[PDB]
Design a binder for this molecule. Structure first.
Ligand SMILES: *C/C=C(C)/C=C/C=C(C)/C=C/C1=C(C)CCCC1(C)C
Length: 230
């Protein structure tokens, strides 16, 4: 087994348990609004499970030549992110009843953020690799700027419980997402300070926090039910 195989195994298992758990809890939820939250936050770990499973199953990796060495890049994980980051932002958008314009902008930027990062990951030219990372971080910064701007995220309209859940969920999102570029930077595709193994491990831990942790936080909320948010 390759050093990083165990963290791909861990992620697969962890996501599968989360998917099954959320799905089970949601099966008894008949509220129209809450069912939507269960739907999105069940789908997110399901996708992660499927994509990590592909890696585990010997698909979803591409080799990229870096500094004379071949790096096994998990392209399947980028395809996961490309799908789940917009869904997670859709959850935040729904919590604060954001406009269509704002929701679509967030979703767009998330997709672009991951597309750029994946382009970076597959670049053999170090200068182009950095550039793609930089452009991706700019999309991430734009997302965070939108989330943080209190004029754009009108909260005055929310019930206390709902506002609190939003604040917690937004804080978690910003804390976690901000860490992804730093792991990338320190890993084999960036500075090469941290081995691939450690990099994979740290990403799996973020992913679990970002999907399972975030899912548990929102789904355990009293504020996702009809007439409970506004
Ligand atoms: C469920 C998975 C989640 C929430 C993944 C989030 C991933 C990111 C925020 C990734 C960001 C990146 C950059 C801003 C720089 C380029 C490399 C990326 C794609 C790791």
């Amino acid at each position: 087994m390759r050093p990083e195989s165990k963290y791909y195994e861990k992620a697969t298992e962890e996501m599968e348990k989360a998917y099954e758990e959320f799905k089970k809890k949601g099966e008894g939820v008949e509220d129209e609004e809450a069912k939507k939250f269960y739907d999105l936050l069940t789908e997110v770990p399901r996708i992660a499970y499927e994509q990590y499973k592909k890696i585990l199953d010997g698909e979803g990796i591409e080799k990229v030549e870096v500094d004379g060495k071949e790096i096994e890049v998990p392209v399947a994980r980028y395809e996961d992110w490309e799908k789940t980051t917009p869904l997670l932002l859709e959850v935040l958008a729904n919590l604060v009843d954001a406009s269509e314009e704002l929701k679509e902008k967030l979703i767009s930027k998330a997709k672009e953020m991951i597309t750029l990062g994946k382009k970076g990951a597959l670049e053999t030219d170090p200068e182009k690799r950095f550039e793609y990372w930089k452009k991706s971080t700019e999309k991430m910064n734009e997302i965070i700027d939108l989330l943080e701007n209190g004029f754009k995220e009108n909260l005055s309209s929310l019930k206390p419980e709902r506002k609190k859940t939003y604040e917690e969920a937004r804080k978690l999102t910003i804390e976690l997402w901000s860490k992804y570029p730093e792991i990338w930077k320190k890993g084999p595709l960036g500075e090469g300070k941290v081995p691939l193994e450690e990099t994979v491990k740290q990403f799996t831990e973020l992913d679990v926090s970002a999907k399972v942790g975030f899912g548990e936080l929102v789904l355990s909320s009293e504020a996702i039910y009809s007439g409970s948010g506004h």
